[PDB]
Design a protein. Structure first.
Lengths: 137, 137, 137
């Protein structure tokens, strides 16, 4: 090979510490693989109260802090996977999702799973690409 | 960085319009992240009739139109995820899958989920790489 | 384009032959997309006996052989998805996972699905990046 690709563990105390043997995200070259985020408060380590709407907000806030630690924001996200405890929460989740993904909407997969870590109602993973990016048509 | 990577929202009217805040696919540099495709008719916005076999055909047709809009075909796909409402549909789905993936078979994950958007019986996401590609051994 | 990216089907007889129309992994440029691995013995084609712990070990061994065939080991893995038949197996699976992922922990998503191929209790997919890699901070 002509290059040694730079791999970095992304880590920020403003998102919850890992609850298992994983990194919050891994950057390799320009691609950031972000772990599935759940609605855990970064301080208490427990899910925020209030159900799917509050959990979704917290999960996206956690994702935002991980992106920021990699020098990115939500405009760098190119793909997400939205894992739901209840498919009937899709409309509620989409409204919250739109508060964070305001442009350049990522590709997405969404589905209801049988269960999530910690009894969460939502988990969101993502792939982001470090800028600069040029958005054409 | 020495380059600004080109990010493009892939969009074609020959696949159904987005049912939420997502793009049909996002191309960034050479990598295309394709959203989970379900068996929705691009005109009516509703699932085709007939169950998993017809839905799988339509989902793959939708994926094919998105690939074509990115200057690709199914030979550019390197990974898929096949999400099933019923794991017992795997054999039926595989026969249809083979009508579209004729060579250079993608890596794949497959599993049964609890529920899919719109009560779909199958959702297929994919990663593709824009050519030219040289397939070695 | 200024380059034709090299795409290679990764194949090793030390991991089970494909049970459907997929490749064990696909390498394209430097990125390896590894199919969901289940606890199948490479010789018998059947799941190993003993439940989730033995299946997880076998699935990771299978993944290790695929990585080795691509000139990689577990340190090249940057993202995994751990699909469980039972979320309550997470702690057991994590202990086994740690026997293979000893450093540079991948990003991860984990959740319980409704069912897996062959009645498996665990399926693990992964993305790896071919070296050389330089791990910074």
């Amino acid at each position: 090979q002509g290059s040694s690709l730079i791999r970095r563990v992304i880590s920020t105390a403003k998102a919850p510490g890992a609850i298992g043997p994983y990194s919050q995200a891994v950057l390799v070259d320009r691609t950031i693989y972000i772990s599935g985020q759940i609605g855990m408060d970064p301080s208490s380590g427990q899910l925020v109260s209030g159900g799917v709407a509050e959990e979704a907000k917290q999960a996206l806030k956690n994702m935002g802090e991980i992106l920021k630690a990699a020098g990115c924001d939500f405009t760098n996200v190119v793909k997400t996977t939205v894992l739901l405890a209840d498919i009937n929460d899709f409309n509620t989740v989409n409204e919250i999702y739109k508060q964070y993904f305001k442009s350049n909407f990522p590709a997405r997969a969404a589905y209801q799973v049988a269960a999530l870590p910690k009894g969460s109602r939502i988990e969101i993973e993502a792939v982001a690409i470090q800028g600069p990016l040029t958005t054409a048509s």
